[PDB]
Amino acid sequence: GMDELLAVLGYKVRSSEMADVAQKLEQLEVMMSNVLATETVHYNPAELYTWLDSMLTDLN
Amino acid sequence: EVNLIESRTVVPLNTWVLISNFKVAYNILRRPDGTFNRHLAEYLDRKVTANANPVDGVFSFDVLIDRRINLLSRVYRPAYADQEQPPSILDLEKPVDGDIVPVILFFHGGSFAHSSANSAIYDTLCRRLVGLCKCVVVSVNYRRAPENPYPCAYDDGWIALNWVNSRSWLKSKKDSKVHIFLAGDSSGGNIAHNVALRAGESGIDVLGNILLNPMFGGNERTESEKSLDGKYFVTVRDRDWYWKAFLPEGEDREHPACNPFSPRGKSLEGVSFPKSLVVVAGLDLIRDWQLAYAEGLKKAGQEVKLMHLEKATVGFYLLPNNNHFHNVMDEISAFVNAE
Numbered sequence: 001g002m003d004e005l006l007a008v009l010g011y012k013v014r015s016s017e018m019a020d021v022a023q024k025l026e027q028l029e030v031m032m033s034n035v036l037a038t039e040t041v042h043y044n045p046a047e048l049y050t051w052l053d054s055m056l057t058d059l060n
Numbered sequence: 061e062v063n064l065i066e067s068r069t070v071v072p073l074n075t076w077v078l079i080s081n082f083k084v085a086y087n088i089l090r091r092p093d094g095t096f097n098r099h100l101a102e103y104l105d106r107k108v109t110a111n112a113n114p115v116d117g118v119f120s121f122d123v124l125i126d127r128r129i130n131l132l133s134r135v136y137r138p139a140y141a142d143q144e145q146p147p148s149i150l151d152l153e154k155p156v157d158g159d160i161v162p163v164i165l166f167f168h169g170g171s172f173a174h175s176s177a178n179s180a181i182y183d184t185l186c187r188r189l190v191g192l193c194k195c196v197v198v199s200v201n202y203r204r205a206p207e208n209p210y211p212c213a214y215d216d217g218w219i220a221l222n223w224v225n226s227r228s229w230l231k232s233k234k235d236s237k238v239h240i241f242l243a244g245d246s247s248g249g250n251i252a253h254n255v256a257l258r259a260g261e262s263g264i265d266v267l268g269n270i271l272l273n274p275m276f277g278g279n280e281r282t283e284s285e286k287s288l289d290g291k292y293f294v295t296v297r298d299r300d301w302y303w304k305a306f307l308p309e310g311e312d313r314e315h316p317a318c319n320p321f322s323p324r325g326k327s328l329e330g331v332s333f334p335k336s337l338v339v340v341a342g343l344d345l346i347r348d349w350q351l352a353y354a355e356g357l358k359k360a361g362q363e364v365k366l367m368h369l370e371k372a373t374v375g376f377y378l379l380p381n382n383n384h385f386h387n388v389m390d391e392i393s394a395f396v397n398a399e
């Protein structure tokens with residue numbers, strides 16, 4: 001079950017995973033506040049879950 | 061230090077995810093030295109093409125309004141009645157049918173540096189406007205800073221306004237005139253204000269302006285800026301960054317492009333200016349500047365309707381899942397369709 005209100009905006013997020021994505025966004029802000037983008041261009045920007053997961057790894 | 065629990069308490073979770081995702085991505089795009097990662101920006105942005113096929117009662121098409129700068133605008137129209145086949149490239153400019161057909165010339169937000177007319181968030185917003193206001197929408201793909209700073213955005217809006225006003229197929233039957241309403245969120249609202257000023261000085265009559273969480277500022281640090289800094293998706297630091305990227309080199313925030321009511325700005329007292337609908341999100345850190353803008357118009361004797369949404373944040377109008385969205389869309393329709 002994908003969130004249709006986000007899908008129309010170009011983002012693919014399963015409604016059941018919304019909280020997990022929200023958690024990843026915060027975890028990413030945390031890392032950024034402690035701090036590259038070259039590897040970012042390789043990731044799929046529509047898949048927020050995997051995108052954030054990939055970014056979190058690039059940092060840390 | 062980072063704790064975003066507070067911002068999650070005021071918005072639906074999916075909305076929080078959408079705005080927060082932009083927030084983190086934009087952190088990466090803005091560089092400390094004032095440069096911008098345009099390539100990554102345009103790669104990350106979610107875009108959509110135009111479509112002559114009516115979807116949910118709306119179809120669209122792109123138009124090149126100025127070749128020298130490759131200025132595009134996307135036109136959104138309600139599906140043609142009794143059409144047996146989809147619109148061909150020769151059926152896109154069919155004369156509007158109706159005594160009065162409002163045309164909203166829209167300018168997207170993004171703080172002067174982000175987004176395009178074909179960004180999914182704005183293509184969706186424009187399609188919703190067509191259906192909720194029963195009108196035609198023309199979204200301008202204005203040039204972005206820092207590459208194309210002031211006055212590029214305003215100049216592009218001026219060109220688009222003249223294009224719209226000169227379309228014979230957009231004329232309302234009532235008075236044989238194109239009924240134009242300027243609209244925009246964030247930086248787009250700022251552009252609407254300035255395009256309106258130029259229109260009034262050139263004879264083009266704009267019937268009304270719709271500003272959603274308009275982007276204005278000034279040298280002073282308002283109370284809302286100090287108290288809300290970083291609490292609801294936006295920081296004074298990034299606000300300063302966008303103003304510096306958009307304004308001329310060496311200028312400060314009292315330049316009229318930033319502060320329309322700066323001592324440097326021309327008075328609006330006794331000036332032919334369209335009626336305005338100003339929407340202010342209570343949790344937008346620049347709330348005080350926006351409220352000051354609405355008060356400035358009122359003080360200048362201009363017609364202004366203020367909608368101060370106490371618990372709304374930036375981007376509340378991107379998802380139809382909250383009362384701020386519903387209430388605002390209702391007022392926009394009433395505004396453009398009012399006598």
Ligand SMILES: C=C1C[C@]23C[C@H]1CC[C@H]2[C@@]12CC[C@H](O)[C@@](C)(C(=O)O1)[C@H]2[C@@H]3C(=O)O
Nearest residue numbers: 082083086169170171246293294298374375
């Ligand atoms: C740096 C920015 C730019 C923000 C504020 C902050 C984080 C979220 C951005 C967007 C992203 C989406 C919308 O265009 C916007 C109009 C919205 O609602 O959120 C933006 C806003 C702005 O330009 O004022």
